């Protein structure tokens, strides 16, 4: 069993009469009825509720999870879920993407660094004479404790509300392969350790959604290894799991993440889809950004590519 899901926002081409029926008719991809963005096969809830966050620069609902009001978040989340997915019977894939911060304190690097600072800054204002060891310990503790609370409670509420859906957080489990610090395709060792201690998340989720977006600034081999390493990590997690069988459906993009004017070549599609399939993923989801099909020219050009390259590649390796 292997199912590919269409999550490209081709609703944006409907105003020009481009409905993309061949996606399921010719290519066997699971597609919402009438190519609705949300429907019985798939539905993404982007940034629902009021997750605590730092929006570029203001603190929404506490800034960091350990200052957040859970009740307020859940109120608004319910409103959004009901708005976005009105049909109680929803059986499809439900993707939640909040993208504010990682539940592992350590993994809030780089752009996410402010979540570490503010966490630490609060502790220092209370205990000005604590040393860095104590402060770091306390900030980590508080952050991970309420960060889990916010992710776990939202998932629980989601399942309670739409109990037949297959829910997952976008991009989890993380892996961080092919970084300046982790130059192999293998996932970073400490992150694999940290993934094992996040059973609370992976036991509750129905579907793991690792993001396997390719980069142009990589070799042909590394693009395969980038994808292999992330699908391995998610498979390793899923096969250790006790509550249910967990689906691995990696998030896949037909653009190069760092070369957005360029569509994946025939060679990368074959090679990367063959790796996702051969490792035994249960399928994958094709994603796209609204910005790349916001003109009639771009819709017809995207459709040319679907029918000349993307569509055939899925059909001949997968379905």
């Amino acid at each position: 069993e292997f199912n590919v899901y269409w999550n490209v926002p081709t609703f944006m081409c409907h105003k020009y009469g481009l409905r993309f029926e061949e996606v399921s008719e010719k290519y066997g991809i699971l597609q919402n009825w009438m190519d609705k963005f949300r429907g019985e096969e798939i539905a993404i809830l982007y940034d629902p509720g009021m997750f605590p966050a730092l929006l570029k620069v203001v603190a929404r609902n506490g800034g960091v999870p350990q200052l957040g009001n859970l009740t307020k978040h859940l109120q608004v989340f319910r409103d959004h879920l009901i708005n976005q997915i009105p049909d109680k019977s929803f059986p499809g894939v439900g993707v939640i993407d909040f993208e504010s911060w990682r539940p592992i304190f350590r993994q809030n690097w780089a752009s996410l660094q402010p979540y570490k600072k503010l966490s630490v800054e609060v502790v220092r204002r209370e205990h000005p004479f604590w040393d860095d060891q104590r402060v770091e310990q306390e900030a980590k503790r508080r952050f991970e404790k309420y960060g889990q609370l916010f992710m776990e409670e939202t998932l629980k509420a989601a399942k309670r509300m739409r109990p037949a859906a297959n829910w997952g957080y976008y991009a989890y489990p993380y892996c961080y392969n092919l970084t300046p610090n982790q130059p192999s395709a293998q996932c970073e060792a400490t992150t694999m350790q940290e993934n094992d201690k996040m059973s609370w998340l992976f036991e509750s989720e129905d579907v793991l959604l690792p993001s396997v977006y390719l980069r142009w600034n990589l070799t042909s081999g590394e693009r395969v290894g980038l994808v292999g390493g992330r699908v391995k990590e998610a498979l390793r997690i899923a096969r250790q799991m006790t509550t249910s069988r967990k689906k691995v459906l990696p998030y896949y993009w037909y653009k190069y993440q760092d070369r957005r004017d360029t569509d994946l070549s025939r060679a990368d599609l074959e090679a990367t889809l063959r790796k996702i399939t051969d490792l035994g993923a249960d399928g994958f989801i094709i994603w796209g950004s609204s910005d790349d099909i916001n003109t009639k020219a771009k819709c017809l050009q995207f459709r040319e590519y679907l029918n000349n390259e993307l569509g055939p590649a899925v059909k001949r390796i997968a379905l």
Partner: antibody
Framework: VTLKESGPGILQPSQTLSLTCSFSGFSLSTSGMGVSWIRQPSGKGLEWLAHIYWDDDKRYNPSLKSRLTISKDTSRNQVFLKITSVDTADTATYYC?????????WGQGTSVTVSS | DIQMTQSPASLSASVGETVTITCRASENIYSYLTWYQQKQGKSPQLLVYNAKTLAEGVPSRFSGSGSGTQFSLKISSLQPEDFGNYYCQHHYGTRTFGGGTRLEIKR
């Protein structure tokens, strides 16, 4: 809140220093609290020795190499400092210090003299 | 081992003048630094915590600045009582002092 250091006053090279800090208006069990031991030889700078937190977690100045032991007894409401192998360079007035929140409390200090 | 270097070792001034004594750290210590005044003693006295936050009941003429490796302590319009010794003390892990500074009354 008040702190009183107590000690031997004078002792001989090679002996063990045993200093006691005693607290009033304050419990050493209180969460987030830390006590430090600092010293100052006459006419010279301050020297940090050791630190202890309410949960028995300790810090030591690796300069002391390491002839120091810090400890506490919550029920006695006291903090202790041991210094083994004293020589004349350990001659100083010794202070204990308390930190809780934004505030900082010092004892009056106990003079310690090391000589034969 | 983190070491703290204060400069200058001595500094002479008159009442009304403004001075800035300095404290440099061997490695980075973010903002884990305190400032202390010691008069002839009298035991030491907290002036500044978290590098920049003024301690309770201390005049606004005092102020602390900087982060990481370079810190300073500015005293505006010096009052007669301000002359004495001054110490920084990091507390990143260990919590060792600098050598201090004696603020001299210019004569």
């Amino acid at each position: 809140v008040t702190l009183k250091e107590s000690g031997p006053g004078i002792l001989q090279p090679s002996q063990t220093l045993s200093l006691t800090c005693s607290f009033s208006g304050f419990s050493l069990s209180t969460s987030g609290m830390g006590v430090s031991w600092i010293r100052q030889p006459s006419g010279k700078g301050l020297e940090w020795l050791a630190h202890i937190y309410w949960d028995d977690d300790k810090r030591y100045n690796p300069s002391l190499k390491s002839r120091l032991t810090i400890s506490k007894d919550t029920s006695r409401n006291q903090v202790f400092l041991k210094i083994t192998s004293v020589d004349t360079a350990d001659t100083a007035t010794y202070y204990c210090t308390l930190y809780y929140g934004s505030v900082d409390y010092w004892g009056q200090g106990t003079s310690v003299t090391v000589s034969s | 081992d983190i070491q703290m270097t204060q400069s200058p070792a001595s500094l002479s001034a008159s009442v009304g003048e403004t001075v800035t004594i300095t404290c440099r750290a061997s490695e980075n210590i973010y903002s884990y630094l305190t400032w202390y005044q010691q008069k002839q003693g009298k035991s030491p006295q907290l002036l500044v915590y978290n590098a920049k936050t003024l301690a309770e009941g201390v005049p606004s003429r005092f102020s602390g600045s900087g982060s990481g490796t370079q810190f300073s302590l500015k005293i505006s319009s010096l009052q007669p009582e301000d002359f004495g010794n001054y110490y920084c003390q990091h507390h990143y892990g260990t919590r060792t002092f600098g050598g201090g500074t004696r603020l001299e009354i210019k004569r």
